[PDB]
Amino acid sequence: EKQAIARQYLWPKQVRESGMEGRIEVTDAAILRVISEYTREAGVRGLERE
């Protein structure tokens, strides 16, 4: 669920608000590594800050 949320809602918003507009992109294994090794939460604010 966190991986689907980060693909559909969180990563496009952080991309749009930074000025990068198709210049940078993450894979799915990258999102899974950010979730599993950089976060201990139940929500999605820490994932959004990463």
């Binding site: 939460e41 929500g43 604010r45 820490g46 800050r49």
Partner: protein
């Protein structure tokens, strides 16, 4: 604008780093010392029906500074009580909420006021005396402590 928290032992430069950050970016500065702040009526205000009523620290700080994007240092955020008498740590959930603080509502001003352009920097000695919904809104930057070199 970001909402940071700087956490570290005493004597490392946390309080003095806020004024340097605000001076390097050519932006206005103001301090609010939250140590020992005990009642909720200093974050929000009172209704304008009591006789000596006036807004809280944030609207007064935004009046002192003339602009809508200052740097505001919220000093000693972990030394803020939640006892019997007052709970200002639950009134801070409205101020530091990164998605909803464009409609902050004071009790004196009956209108929503936009606090989404202000650069908040808060300082603490340890993270363990901060409420868990309030810690989850802030981004941690850890200041470790110096070596001999």
């Amino acid at each position: 604008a970001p909402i940071l928290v700087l956490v570290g032992p005493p004597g490392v430069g946390k309080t003095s780093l806020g004024r340097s950050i605000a001076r390097s970016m050519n932006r206005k500065f103001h301090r609010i010392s939250l140590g020992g702040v005990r009642d909720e009526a200093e974050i929000r205000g009172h209704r304008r029906t009591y006789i000596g009523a006036m807004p809280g620290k944030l609207i007064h700080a935004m009046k002192q500074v003339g602009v809508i994007n200052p740097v505001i240092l919220l000093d000693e955020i972990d030394k803020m009580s939640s006892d019997w008498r007052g709970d200002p740590a639950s009134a801070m959930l409205e101020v530091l909420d990164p998605e909803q603080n464009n409609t902050f509502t004071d009790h004196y001003l009956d209108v929503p006021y936009d606090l989404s352009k202000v650069f908040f920097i808060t300082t603490a000695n340890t993270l363990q005396t901060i409420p868990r919904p309030l810690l989850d809104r802030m981004e941690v930057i850890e200041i470790p402590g110096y070596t001999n070199m």
